[PDB]
Amino acid sequence: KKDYRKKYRKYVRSRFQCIEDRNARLGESVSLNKRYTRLRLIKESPIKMELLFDPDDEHSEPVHTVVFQGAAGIGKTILARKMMLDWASGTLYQDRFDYLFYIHCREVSLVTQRSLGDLIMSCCPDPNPPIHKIVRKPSRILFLMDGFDELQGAFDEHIGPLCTDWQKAERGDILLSSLIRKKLLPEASLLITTRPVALEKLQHLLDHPRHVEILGFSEAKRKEYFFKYFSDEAQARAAFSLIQENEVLFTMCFIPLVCWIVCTGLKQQMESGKSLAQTSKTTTAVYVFFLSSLLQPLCAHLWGLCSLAADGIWNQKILFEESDLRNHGLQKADVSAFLRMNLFQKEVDCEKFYSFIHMTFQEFFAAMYYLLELPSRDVTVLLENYGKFEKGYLIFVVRFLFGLVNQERTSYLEKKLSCKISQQIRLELLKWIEVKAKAKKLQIQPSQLELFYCLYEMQEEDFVQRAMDYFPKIEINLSTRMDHMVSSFCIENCHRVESLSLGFLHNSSFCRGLFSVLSTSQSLTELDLSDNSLGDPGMRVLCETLQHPGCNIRRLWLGRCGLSHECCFDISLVLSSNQKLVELDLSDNALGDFGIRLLCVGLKHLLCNLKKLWLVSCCLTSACCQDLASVLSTSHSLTRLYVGENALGDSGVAILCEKAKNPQCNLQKLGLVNSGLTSVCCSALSSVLSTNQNLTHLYLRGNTLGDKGIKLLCEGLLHPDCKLQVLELDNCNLTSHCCWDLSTLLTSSQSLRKLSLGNNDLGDLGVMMFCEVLKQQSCLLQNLGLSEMYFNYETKSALETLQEEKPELTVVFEPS
Amino acid sequence: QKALRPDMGYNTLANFRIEKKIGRGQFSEVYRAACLLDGVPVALMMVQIFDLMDAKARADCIKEIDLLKQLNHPNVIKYYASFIEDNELNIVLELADAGDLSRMIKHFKKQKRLIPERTVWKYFVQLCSALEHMHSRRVMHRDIKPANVFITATGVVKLGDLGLGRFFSSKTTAAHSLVGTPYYMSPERIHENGYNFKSDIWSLGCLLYEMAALQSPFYGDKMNLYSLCKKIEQCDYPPLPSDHYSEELRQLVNMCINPDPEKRPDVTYVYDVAKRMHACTASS
């Protein structure tokens, strides 16, 4: 008359009483689960650990699978552990699930065969649980599989024999896939935590996942960690003051693992009566510092450890036995030394294996191996397998290698490294970068930003400045402060970048640094900041940096950036002093009549060399044409103006035309596209065409001129002083009635090079008419549009005939 | 103008006011109109099937509209009503005249600038969502290309079906040498072997390529149907620039444009990829 749910909950509460998940916790101390600091969780408002599987907003679609992602050191596993405890304590999902099964990815084979006994191995001590009873019932259970990227051995997604029926034993990879795809024990819930890199081999298995990103600590939380870590506030204050002084390390401490390493190092320094100095700048520096502080107080075992680490990476081994330790010459005294020192763990949770305190450390040691004085010791093979899941991606192994391979070497064990090798590696890394820099990747392993992280770690100007010569175009997607810092460093030392594309993501007026760096670039030509949340506050900061004498920016793209009319003030201030900017795109913003009126001041201002200005879809009305027309008259430098997709009706155009008409205006192109114009505006346009010989491209597509408008426009175009080369007439509500006048134009004008006729009812006869007349020594060189038009056989045949008979018409374009 | 009749809902043109024509198909015309009952701007699709089908043949067109009316998604053009009066078929659709993908592409061409990958995924992922919705209900689009991809002022993608009345032109394929745009058609559609769901994937891949390249993968100068078909059958088209687009984007295109009809990915796969890519370049 006893249940099992209670027995298990007690077991779970018992096993997860400590974060360290073991004994020998730095003098057998208590980890204290209250030590847990809340991590920021953002749904692909903050998201709670609770309600993760709840139905969505409409049709109440339930969630079976929730996938968490984040960088190593963020706390993916600690979050899962906290979750297991809160549930066992009856506070989290205590109503939703009867059992939770927590399984470590590093503890499960992908090569051996077994039944789904994982639910038994992870259960209370009872070797024979009611696995066939309520525990068997799907939807009443949730599985927690953390460290997908930590899975050891090759793993495939293309598995035919997926295998359902938990009672059946099968290979671990198949078993895992079947669970992930919800084929085994379907309708059960599953929570996965993984490094973003492993998404490449996970997304294929999810069907309909919910995604949450796990972020690191905020400034406030970083402070809490120090004060919760150091129970003596006097020590916490010293530690906190020290991290505040070392701003770079403070930034890196957003990752809990990093702040832990720092705090652990400081704790030792405090215990030893040291000054508590901490001068680390890079991730490598931190790891070297830690190892030095722990081990230097030796190389005989360090070499052996490095060999072990390297072997474990290549042989996909995380959990080592006494026989493996002996194989690397590690036994008894040193093994013990690294248990009293917090370098290795003994996996005391029903296991007899030894492992690294963190996977990053294993990679650190493996990286170290290559530089000392035997799976290979080659760098080429190491780099070749960089993109391979099967080798663990080797991301930290390489990143650390970059930091370790430096001329600015230190002592303390580091003297053991061979400079001959370091020099060989350095050269190979440069060649590697040149190759990886040529082909953009977003979610692979190289990723542009990732290369910058590697360059950042290798704090050597000669190396980095040379490496940066392979990035003529830089495209980045910054998220956190650490990304801004790294980007600023790499860009500052770049002398060969022409195009910068910043895909700013989320978590404004803090960016600074990067813009301060961009303004000092000597090669940067184009700055593309479109399609991101560069709201006015960000634009103001950018504008301040854009006034720097050395900006050298020729093109600035600011499309759908969410700018308001207010930003035009700051832009005007840039135009008034920045004599380098040539092309400015402010399209897709809310820069209404007031905003443009301000911009007109900057445009009229002397020394404004802007030649090309795009103002498409800027919420303008005809009212603003009064000021813009003055710009055309006043500013000799502006030649290209695009104001389509605004409320500039016939009256707006007439205003612009009155000034554009003046033959001393330099306007060359008019983007009067979706302006809502009628045949009435053609009078004004005609006057301009017959007067201003500087106009070469006129875009009227999107208007509704009809045949009357064409006739009026033609009268202007047929004038001997009309120099228009390209005319764009897409759906202008035209009919076949206008074909006579267009026909006349085609055999009358001399300056016309292209007549683009788009989706309008020109008619079959209209086209056939054109074919006959265009043959009569036409001056046209380009096509005649005719897209999105339907023609009959004879018409199509006649058009094709024209294409063959008159090859000087390089393009004609049939719609077929 | 006929008097308003609220009691007949949207089952009569008496309750709508046409302001202008907005497009034209070969089996239908498309008008811009406002609803006189509630002031809502709508798209009116006028289909003339009476000169093509009798009362019996016309029945073949019922299933298509009855099925389309069951769709309900923020990235799909909504169907409100359908009726027959004055010997004409009238379908009331959600209006999306703010702009479209075709206009966006033309804009980028004029600027001589390529669409940032972060801006490609921004719209592409939305289109994929719309298609997932349709396919999960076993609804095929059969005409995916910029012409039917509408974009709101807020940058929201809505997939329409205006096309050229392809739902009606199902038994008159002889005319499709002139009616249709065989740049988005798979080899199977060209061979008239039937249009499967994987053929929407082909056309989706084509669209993605076109956005990235600002041109169709099977475009050419004075290219006739014969040569066009050969290029399509051989899956022969220029690659996208390695320093402008990610490898993953190119792989997605390569998987979608697969001359082997059984080797294309489904919509769910493509959508999940688009989401994961977008999620890394998704501006806030």
Ligand SMILES: Nc1ncnc2c1ncn2[C@@H]1O[C@H](COP(=O)(O)OP(=O)(O)OP(=O)(O)O)[C@@H](O)[C@H]1O
């Ligand atoms: N949210 C947190 N609150 C308090 N301490 C934390 C937190 N996250 C991580 N830690 C600190 O970082 C150290 C390592 O944490 P952890 O093992 O979870 O890194 P991890 O990357 O999540 O491991 P894994 O890769 O297997 O998920 C812990 O010993 C602890 O001191």
Ligand SMILES: CC(C)(O)c1coc(S(=O)(=O)NC(=O)Nc2c3c(cc4c2CCC4)C=CC3)c1
């Ligand atoms: C593109 C990007 C930001 O570099 C990235 C995103 O995700 C990864 S990760 O999967 O390789 N994890 C990590 O790099 N963790 C990690 C980081 C730093 C320092 C340390 C760690 C682990 C402990 C020391 C510096 C930021 C990343 C990398």
